[PDB]
Scaffold this active site. Sequence first.
Site, PDB file in Angstrom:
ATOM      1  N   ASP A 171      -0.152   0.255 -11.029  1.00  0.00           N
ATOM      2  CA  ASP A 171       0.377   0.834  -9.772  1.00  0.00           C
ATOM      3  C   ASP A 171      -0.729   1.670  -9.136  1.00  0.00           C
ATOM      4  O   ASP A 171      -1.860   1.174  -8.973  1.00  0.00           O
ATOM      5  CB  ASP A 171       1.689   1.593 -10.070  1.00  0.00           C
ATOM      6  CG  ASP A 171       2.314   2.225  -8.813  1.00  0.00           C
ATOM      7  OD1 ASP A 171       2.839   1.445  -7.991  1.00  0.00           O
ATOM      8  OD2 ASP A 171       2.266   3.488  -8.636  1.00  0.00           O
ATOM      9  N   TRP A 172      -0.462   2.921  -8.753  1.00  0.00           N
ATOM     10  CA  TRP A 172      -1.492   3.725  -8.121  1.00  0.00           C
ATOM     11  C   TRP A 172      -2.608   4.074  -9.095  1.00  0.00           C
ATOM     12  O   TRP A 172      -3.719   4.395  -8.650  1.00  0.00           O
ATOM     13  CB  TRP A 172      -0.863   4.978  -7.506  1.00  0.00           C
ATOM     14  CG  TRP A 172      -0.339   4.709  -6.134  1.00  0.00           C
ATOM     15  CD1 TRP A 172       0.969   4.755  -5.722  1.00  0.00           C
ATOM     16  CD2 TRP A 172      -1.109   4.337  -4.986  1.00  0.00           C
ATOM     17  NE1 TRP A 172       1.052   4.445  -4.383  1.00  0.00           N
ATOM     18  CE2 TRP A 172      -0.210   4.188  -3.909  1.00  0.00           C
ATOM     19  CE3 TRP A 172      -2.476   4.128  -4.763  1.00  0.00           C
ATOM     20  CZ2 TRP A 172      -0.629   3.833  -2.631  1.00  0.00           C
ATOM     21  CZ3 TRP A 172      -2.891   3.778  -3.484  1.00  0.00           C
ATOM     22  CH2 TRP A 172      -1.967   3.632  -2.439  1.00  0.00           C
ATOM     23  N   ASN A 231       2.943   5.970 -10.044  1.00  0.00           N
ATOM     24  CA  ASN A 231       4.037   6.794  -9.531  1.00  0.00           C
ATOM     25  C   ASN A 231       5.374   6.241  -9.999  1.00  0.00           C
ATOM     26  O   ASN A 231       5.592   5.025  -9.893  1.00  0.00           O
ATOM     27  CB  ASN A 231       3.986   6.829  -8.000  1.00  0.00           C
ATOM     28  CG  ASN A 231       4.927   7.860  -7.398  1.00  0.00           C
ATOM     29  OD1 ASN A 231       4.936   9.020  -7.811  1.00  0.00           O
ATOM     30  ND2 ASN A 231       5.711   7.442  -6.397  1.00  0.00           N
ATOM     31  N   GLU A 272       0.944  -4.948 -12.148  1.00  0.00           N
ATOM     32  CA  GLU A 272       1.771  -4.369 -11.092  1.00  0.00           C
ATOM     33  C   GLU A 272       0.928  -3.434 -10.222  1.00  0.00           C
ATOM     34  O   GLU A 272       1.295  -2.291  -9.930  1.00  0.00           O
ATOM     35  CB  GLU A 272       2.988  -3.667 -11.702  1.00  0.00           C
ATOM     36  CG  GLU A 272       4.099  -4.661 -12.159  1.00  0.00           C
ATOM     37  CD  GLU A 272       4.803  -5.326 -10.975  1.00  0.00           C
ATOM     38  OE1 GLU A 272       5.066  -4.618  -9.971  1.00  0.00           O
ATOM     39  OE2 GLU A 272       5.093  -6.549 -11.049  1.00  0.00           O
ATOM     40  N   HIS A 306       8.792  -3.681 -12.423  1.00  0.00           N
ATOM     41  CA  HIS A 306       7.601  -2.928 -12.065  1.00  0.00           C
ATOM     42  C   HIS A 306       7.079  -2.140 -13.252  1.00  0.00           C
ATOM     43  O   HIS A 306       5.882  -2.151 -13.515  1.00  0.00           O
ATOM     44  CB  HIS A 306       7.873  -1.976 -10.911  1.00  0.00           C
ATOM     45  CG  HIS A 306       6.682  -1.150 -10.541  1.00  0.00           C
ATOM     46  ND1 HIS A 306       5.541  -1.702  -9.997  1.00  0.00           N
ATOM     47  CD2 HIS A 306       6.438   0.176 -10.668  1.00  0.00           C
ATOM     48  CE1 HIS A 306       4.659  -0.742  -9.773  1.00  0.00           C
ATOM     49  NE2 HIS A 306       5.177   0.405 -10.173  1.00  0.00           N
TER      50      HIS A 306
END
Length: 297
Positions: free
Chosen positions: A108-109, A41, A132, A275
């Site tokens: 991430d996701w 995201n 991350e 990130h």
Amino acid sequence: TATGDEWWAKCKQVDVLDSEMSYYDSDPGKHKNTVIFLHGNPTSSYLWRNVIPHVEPLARCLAPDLIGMGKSGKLPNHSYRFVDHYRYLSAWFDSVNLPEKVTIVCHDWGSGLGFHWCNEHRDRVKGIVHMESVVSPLKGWESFPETARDILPQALRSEAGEEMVLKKNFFIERLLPSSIMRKLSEEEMDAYREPFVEPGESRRPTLTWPREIPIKGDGPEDVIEIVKSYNKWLSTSKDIPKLFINADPGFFSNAIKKVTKNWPNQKTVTVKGLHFLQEDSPEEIGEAIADFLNELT
């Protein structure tokens, strides 16, 4: 380099359940060594555009746009919860003629979905590269990185989330540039804006994702349990070669380095970034993945 339209001209589409997903595929249908790149995201497969070229000479490279994001279809019920993404992503995995085992590269996701897919399809995984990433439930709003301790409770996980995201595109216009070290060209920024041009529900994916973050005590409990389960598997996964790409100074990376310190069979390389480290060190990330694939073989 790389307009949004040049990137997405390289991508194909495939029907997935009652919708469609866009994805990059360097070698459609081939069962040679295969790597799948999962974004999070509020990005898309565009995030990998400068990494993939370092890996493609060794492997078929796939990079899907998660449902509701990039050029993938928008859902009329605009339900974009973790389990909804996993439904469409799992169907996508079954729809692109994958070989018997694959390497997952995730962020991430994309790592939440990828780790969960791996945990449910353990005999299909020859390696995992994560960065991350979502490796554990969080103890509380305290264990979140310092720059976002207030951003996540107030605002996005609040009543005010709708207006900040759906109306003023907070994740794209504010959060995305805030965790890149360089400044994106407006070409690159437009590529990230394109999926969420229209105000309203088209942006719902970028608001549901922060509401899925597994905060022990708060919730959501179903994501908390998914993450605990694949964390348990990963932490004793002696047979699964893992590469943790640590971002310096990073965002989640400091916390991930601690969670995974004793994970068996995990190598760590460090690159420069926050990130969205792919936008600051794509060459080093790509060459680290390339090295990792050569070790697998």
